[PDB]
Design a protein around this ligand. Structure first.
Ligand SMILES: [Zn+2]
Ligand SMILES: [Zn+2]
Length: 78
């Protein structure tokens, strides 16, 4: 990354006064801040939202991969 605006200004945050001022290679705000944009794709994206009742009762769900419900192998014997 380039030396400009990829990190916040330590002098501006702690001391407020910055030695270079507006010629500071660091950002004096979030609008000034253009950091190296790392992917935000970390959160869990669920197609299958609620548990599958058919897969829990009969052990089988007819939709399979199409199922909008979570196929969880539930322990316990009848
Ligand atoms: Zn600065
Ligand atoms: Zn299912």
């Amino acid at each position: 990354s380039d030396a400009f605006k990829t990190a916040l200004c330590d002098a501006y945050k702690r001391s407020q006064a910055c030695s270079y001022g507006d010629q500071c290679r660091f950002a004096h705000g979030v609008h000034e801040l253009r950091l190296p944009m790392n992917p935000r794709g970390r959160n869990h994206p669920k197609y299958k939202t609620v548990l599958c009742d058919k897969f829990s009762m009969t052990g089988n769900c007819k939709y399979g991969t199409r199922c909008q419900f979570i196929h969880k192998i539930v322990d316990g014997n009848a």
